[PDB]
Amino acid sequence: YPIGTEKEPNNSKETASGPIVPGIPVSGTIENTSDQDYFYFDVITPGEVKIDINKLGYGGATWVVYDENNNAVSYATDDGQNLSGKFKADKPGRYYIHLYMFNGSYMPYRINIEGSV
Ligand SMILES: [Ca+2]
């Protein structure tokens, strides 16, 4: 049952919205800097995973991806308008995207994921 949008409250990993799957963009909004948005997706077979989050408002935001054991496997690179990055998932399991805004008022966004998901 893939999602197309975040589902509040999703302010922790235990309440993360998901799963996210390739080919189905996910919409949300960072409401203000106190809004933390967590998502999850499942890796079923080893492979490269790519994440692109289009920033559809002004502000500083970024994301980190965690594995099930709270290790960070991937951090965002800002190109100005997209927060992107990729990693090699050596092991199947659930991964979590932690998205937040460190400095901004209001940010819509759109998550796209590609690869072995
Ligand atoms: Ca949230």
Three-state DSSP state, 58: coil
In which residue are the tokens 């966004």 written? 109
CATH of the domain at 90: 2.60.120.380
SS (H, E, C) 59-107: CEEEEEEECCCCCEEEECEECCCEEEEEEEECCCEEEEEEEEEEECCCE
Number of residues written out for the chain: 117
Q: Is the CB of residue 38 less than 8 Å from the CB of residue 99?
A: yes
**How was this one solved?**
X-ray
Number of domains in the chain: 1
What is the resolution in angstroms?
A: 2.2
Interstrand relation of 93-103 and 37-43 (parallel, antiparallel or unpaired): antiparallel
Q: Is the CB of residue 53 less than 8 Å from the CB of residue 114?
A: no
Q: Which domain holds residue 30?
A: 1-117
> Dihedral of the CA atoms 76, 61, 3, 38 (nearest 10)?
90
C-alpha 43 to ligand 1 mean position (Å): 23
Q: 29 labelled as ligand-binding? A: yes
Element (DSSP H or E) covering residue 30: strand 26-30
C-alpha 9 to ligand 1 mean position (Å): 6
